[PDB]
């Protein structure tokens with residue numbers, strides 16, 4: 001038989017991972033699609049009069065097997081893939097695209113949905129009806145049949161190309177991991193990092209050597225510490241050449257097809273299509289916001305580059321920025337990255353930082369379940385409870401890098417909350433921390449600590465969902481709003497009373513001295529020029545790919561020209577991703593939406609101020625934020641929810657202050 005054919009019997013609907021094997025995926029996708037096609041055909045050809053229940057709610061009820069297999073398959077394809085999963089991906093993704101289009105371009109189905117009036121529907125039901133009409137129109141339901149035929153071909157080619165991009169990038173990233181034969185070449189690297197690099201070598205079939213895998217962004221952590229400048233350059237070059245050449249012609253084709261598709265649907269650019277379902281009102285509002293931020297950010301980067309040139313005594317290459325920045329921090333603040341690492345051990349950060357903050361703010365509590373079975377042996381499963389002891393959901397944490405896991409960090413849901421189905425949320429976080437050898441502590445950079453709080457913010461958004469319909473569950477909000485709950489949860493990593501609770505030495509338990517912890521906090525306002533410019537460069541790169549007049553001939557030439565035109569081609573500050581490894585825009589859902597992070601950050605920064613205005617870290621304030629915003633999913637207009645919470649529309653001044661942009 002097949003474990004996807006029945007609902008999970010496990011707690012919270014945790015999928016039965018012990019019973020699931022790769023041979024189950026294809027037959028469950030095939031059944032899932034067949035059973036959902038039949039359900040839709042029954043709705044579309046229903047002889048009874050069209051109602052919200054027998055049309056819109058009926059579609060929400062459909063696709064249960066497909067939902068189940070999809071939840072597990074896409075979780076594995078991100079977190080723990082293998083050649084077999086990647087072959088299944090090649091076969092199934094085109095079928096799923098054609099499947100979605102078979103439903104959205106069903107003419108009698110759409111005519112049915114259009115016959116439903118709002119009369120007598122509660123707020124969420126009327127909102128779902130509008131959302132369904134929008135989803136269908138955005139998928140081509142109002143196009144003529146010739147145009148529908150071309151759109152089907154466009155969509156299938158796009159999904160295939162995006163799949164090829166991700167597989168290319170995983171293969172090349174893994175193969176570009178930097179191998180070091182002589183430990184002398186790791187001079188400067190903390191002892192625990194040397195040990196992790198030997199463990200990585202052992203795990204990847206090179207015992208006795210040291211391996212430094214690449215992280216997703218351009219900037220590689222090791223450059224902060226490594227004194228061997230030739231190795232810093234070799235690592236930097238391995239980073240920036242990811243996707244070269246094999247992803248070049250691929251992303252040109254993706255961008256070209258996105259433009260063709262957007263025009264087919266009535267939009268001049270892909271970005272105009274994307275922005276039409278974003279909280280940002282127009283493409284003009286996006287370019288205007290960015291145009292205000294970019295000039296001050298670049299001026300900051302120039303001032304910072306002068307400081308590093310003075311420190312170094314000489315001119316710099318991109319592979320020297322982090323290294324001299326660390327020297328400046330040690331000199332100015334007495335903060336040495338190697339001496340900070342011992343205060344940030346994974347277990348303590350998790351228990352006494354991430355969970356702790358959530359308990360003080362929201363009253364929720366956590367029980368680790370080492371007896372429940374995750375999808376990989378290193379996954380930690382946690383049961384989550386409300387303050388009153390009632391069951392809330394499950395949280396799965398998967399913290400370490402491995403060759404089967406794509407770069408970066410992300411949240412996803414195995415089970416979405418809805419009262420329609422009576423399901424509880426089951427949410428996952430994946431990070432890419434280097435795994436220590438047996439017995440050794442997992443010491444973290446503060447960037448990794450921040451990432452842990454960011455992903456947990458997405459987790460809480462998922463866990464606090466109290467919606468009726470699964471279309472609106474948890475994180476189902478526009479991309480330029482979804483990065484608000486994640487970014488605002490980062491406030492707790494640096495809230496001093498929380499930071500003081502977890503920043504304790506891994507061996508002794510001793511808190512960091514109060515005046516050093518003060519300066520570690522100060523040292524994070526440092527380098528806002530670099531940090532802001534690398535982000536804005538990538539944002540403007542994304543924008544250029546999805547707003548061109550004429551299509552590009554050459555990917556690398558296009559990138560250069562885009563960055564020069566936008567005034568952010570800085571030798572010392574490359575974009576945070578270059579085109580050929582910009583996974584956010586070519587294989588995930590952030591095309592013409594990398595700006596989402598800074599757009600959402602307005603709301604984050606303004607919300608930090610709300611907490612200070614209302615007495616800080618108090619249970620009452622957590623209940624308000626949860627009730628008014630985090631529990632809503634997509635079930636209400638996000639900006640109205642923000643306004644009801646904040647007391648007014650957003651102010652940008654707090655973001656500007658944070659990033660030094662006034």
Ligand SMILES: CC[C@H](C)[C@H](NC(C)=O)C(=O)N[C@@H](Cc1ccc(O)cc1)C(=O)N[C@@H](Cc1ccc(O)cc1)P(=O)(O)O
Nearest residue numbers: 074408409410411412413458475476477482583584587588
């Ligand atoms: C294959 C599952 C996706 C990874 C997931 N999508 C879903 C529906 O869970 C998803 O888009 N997750 C978003 C946060 C997010 C979550 C849901 C959303 O609807 C949108 C965004 C996320 O974790 N984004 C991360 C960025 C990222 C994630 C995946 C990539 O391939 C590239 C970048 P973060 O900003 O936390 O660094």
Ligand SMILES: [Mg+2]
Nearest residue numbers: 450487490597
């Ligand atoms: Mg950030």
Ligand SMILES: [Mg+2]
Nearest residue numbers: 514515518519
């Ligand atoms: Mg002090």
Ligand SMILES: [Zn+2]
Nearest residue numbers: 454458483486
């Ligand atoms: Zn995020």
